[PDB]
Chain length 251, copies 4
């Protein structure tokens, strides 16, 4: 049978491009969403028109809470229910906003920023592993090429992305005996935030050495496709920067 | 007037050595503790006998919860109540235990303890310290092995990576206030009290520089340097104090 | 119409596997070699049998010396002479042996370990850029660069210098459309001279599979980085190490 | 009996400040110099006025060449002949100028890779060969906090400074059994060229989060003094950034 993948935050932007490219590669896909039901279903409709019964949607809030472990177990379960297997987990869903150190409650911001970017990937990783040859099992975490030169006033976001690097490495070591590889893709500037102004976006584009433009979502997805492929069978614990050289540029 | 410091998890082991060395350098200290009340009170008594009214204790659970922000605000308030200022914060308190990915505490309690103590509480204490504000600095106790982690310690490792992120992000953001933010990263220092001697010696034998763990004082010496005037231009730096351990391959 | 690639130290082992996989991908290839003339000519014969006029050999010593720039210029020139273009450079050739700090001359060790692993890549990069679509350079790095083998100081210095070159050249050549990336093996093909017991010792250290990477696994990462699927990637070093660099002492 | 230190490139700027602070700490010093003989002698005379017979000069070109190993052996020998011991080596001397990818290039290699990396390596060999519980032996290499966000067109300089990181780590591992520690100090923006226009200096100063100014040579020297002290006796293989946060600043 075809392998199956879960992509979190898959209704739009980078997660959608990842789901599309996995599907084009021959995967059946679980399209996870929180608020974007109409977009999730629109994508599933598009993929199922290409190949019947090869895409399902799955709703969950990935904010940390007392119920997050059960939510994460249910996302993994949805893949096994639809497809009978779950070969690939892509932890793409992410909250992103500033949290100044000097003046939503701060503890809500913790639950969102550290929940979506680190704790939910951790719980999904546990559930994915618990449910596990010619198999090619792997997890890809969407990281951030600027983790070591962070945006001003983004402490909690940066802490969450750092925690995700730690998860990538710890899980790669711990799951290697099961043949599960765990890797990351770290975009620099890709699709800019919808809310961001045009002038601010051009400011970011101009800093990129390679072509003075942001990565398309498809360019990010290309690195994910490589890491889940048979061409990456010895690669685990690696984080591939896809940033056009941005992280190499000094202040 | 003498400067004052908050040290978290200061009743025993490395946090006590830090509080003692700060005290010996001339600081007044807040000795934070969670469960180790007798040890905390014993240390404050020793320091106060050395120079009166130079040490207080402050109790707090640093597990993450909706009241953790108020707890962290209260630890910093305790320093200002006792001493009228707060010059230095050392984020030392830490939970440390395995959380295997494949199979008493629920996973959400493990998250609240391992990520709370190692990362969120340092973050909220950093916010409270900065909000209340000369040689001001914060020192975070990091881990030199963050990129070659112990098997089955994923949540602990996530929390220490988050602490690196806080160290860098806060150094950038608080530099305009003249608050420096740095880290000290031990390799093997005081082994866990529950560990048997044979298992302790396994760890000792790994260390290139002398095949022994760091003393608590050796860790404290790096903290003392980073809060001193000899580190006035240093911010966002994490000093490994690991005897070469992190350079040793498999 | 076919693009062309230079691979250094391409007669045997990982460089051979990279030359073969590039050729299978559609590249014309310059097979650089130093001493392995028979193996180099054998490979070119094999590739030319598959598609005529798609492989040549090029001999050069990559030890540092005052004529190394000319030698590196000549390797790049050989690609233009044979194929009229040079799209890809793979810096694979490398000397590897211990240089203990406490007791060939040391100056020869420096010329060989720093020359092959760092200075020749730099001069090849210069000549590649000066002579100039999907242009790219791939440097073979070492995943163990921050947990070095005991008594391999000069080797480790050369591989750290190569990381520096990868990043510096990525920045400097980005405006010309040339991407510069690295692939960092952990343990791949073990040295021919190493005993079976030591080989097994290294294999047992690797989390993912308890075995070394095949040369083909390393080549597969090189293929990705030169491909259209990596056209926004520059300055990146991909570890291909089965988790080895994550394992504590 | 007083310990002794070799400082390379000690006639001016950072190396001068290191030599002065070591002398103030109680060390006898070898002031290595290449071209600045007048300044090296002037420093030796100042230090000897403070305490007789505590400073000597040693001239050597640290460009790589057939004779560089002999030169580096001589520098260490000079400390033993003057003072009967050599406790500390500070590899401070450094060439710094652009080498665009698009003086012969082999001269540039000899100067940039020889000063910044090969001479430190040969000095390290000579230091260790001479030592083959009051003792506190250590080497401090002057590294660069911006090594992973390099200046445009400085490839050979950056390669040399990355090689020096490798030396620091490799030598820490290998010399640990002899009780020799090996560490680094990595400045960001420190003493700028006096001839550099103040407009350009200000461009660099405004980049630095902590104080919007460059480090003094004394601030760099303070980190060296810590690393060679009794307070750093478990520290080996560590590189301390002294950069005011500059390396954390994104493009
Ligand atoms: N875009 C860029 O430039 C960069 C991206 N990255 C990383 O790449 C990945 C994708 O980035 P991008 O496409 O911009 O991401 P977005 O900011 O567009 O967020 C992706 C999705 O995450 C989901 N999400 C947000 N909060 C929650 C929550 N509480 N519960 C569940 N799902 C949630 C949302 O799904 P829904 O819409 O269904 O509510 C959202 O559509 C992320 O991990 C990001 O950090 C890293 C660096 C730069
Ligand atoms: N020891 C070592 O070898 C290493 C240490 N480090 C780091 O150095 C620092 C000191 O290490 P060490 O002395 O071994 O630390 P310990 O494990 O001894 O813990 C220090 C203190 O943390 C406090 N703590 C634990 N959980 C909580 C909580 N929920 N709320 C509040 N306080 C809490 C405890 O206070 P109480 O006793 O009052 O309950 C404890 O005494 C830590 O950050 C550690 O991660 C890093 C690498 C190795
Ligand atoms: N094998 C492994 O486990 C690992 C490999 N790597 C890196 O991967 C790359 C390939 O590794 P591997 O295949 O083992 O390499 P080898 O050790 O097999 O060397 C590759 C080739 O380099 C050439 N070479 C050596 N010295 C010189 C010189 N003075 N002038 C010119 N060429 C020279 C030789 O060519 P000839 O035979 O023609 O004389 C040799 O065949 C290297 O850069 C290596 O550092 C990194 C980590 C681990
Ligand atoms: N200044 C800064 O902002 C920064 C400095 N650093 C590092 O800190 C250290 C000190 O910096 P700084 O004081 O500015 O250094 P300088 O550029 O002033 O150079 C120091 C000395 O190196 C010596 N030197 C140069 N070339 C040779 C050679 N061929 N042979 C022997 N000695 C030579 C020269 O000695 P002489 O005058 O006797 O000929 C020179 O005075 C260096 O390693 C530097 O890379 C790192 C980052 C930034
Ligand atoms: N770094 C980013 C950017 C962005 N636009 N969205 C997320 N979730 N993370
Ligand atoms: N890394 C460690 C070791 C230890 N013994 N305790 C804590 N909190 N952290
Ligand atoms: N050149 C080489 C050969 C080899 N066998 N291993 C390494 N790291 N490099
Ligand atoms: N990084 C630098 C700056 C500078 N002025 N001199 C040297 N040798 N290195």
């Amino acid at each position: 049978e075809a392998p199956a993948a879960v992509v979190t935050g898959a209704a739009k932007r980078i997660g959608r491009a990842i789901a599309v490219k996995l599907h084009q590669t021959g995967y059946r896909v679980v399209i996870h969403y929180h608020n974007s039901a109409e977009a999730a279903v629109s994508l599933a409709d598009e993929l199922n028109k290409e190949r019947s019964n090869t895409a399902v949607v799955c709703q969950a809030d990935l904010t940390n809470s007392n119920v997050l472990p059960a939510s994460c177990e249910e996302i993994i379960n949805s893949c096994f229910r639809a497809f009978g297997r779950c070969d690939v987990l892509v932890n793409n869903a992410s909250a992103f906003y500033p949290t100044p150190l000097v003046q939503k409650t701060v503890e809500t911001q913790v639950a969102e920023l550290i929940g979506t970017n680190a704790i939910a990937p951790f719980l999904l990783t546990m559930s994915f592993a618990q449910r596990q040859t010619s198999s090619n099992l792997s997890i890809v975490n969407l990281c951030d090429a600027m983790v070591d030169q962070p945006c001003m006033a983004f402490s909690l976001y940066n802490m969450g992305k750092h925690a995700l690097v730690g998860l990538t490495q710890s899980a790669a070591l711990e799951l290697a005996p099961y043949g599960i590889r765990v890797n990351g893709v770290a975009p620099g500037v890709s699709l800019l935030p919808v809310a961001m102004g045009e002038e601010e976006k051009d400011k970011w584009r101009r800093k990129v050495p390679l072509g003075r433009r942001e990565a398309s979502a498809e360019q990010i997805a290309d690195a994910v496709i490589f890491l889940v492929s048979g061409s990456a069978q010895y690669i685990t614990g690696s984080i591939i920067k896809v940033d056009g050289g941005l992280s190499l540029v000094h202040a």
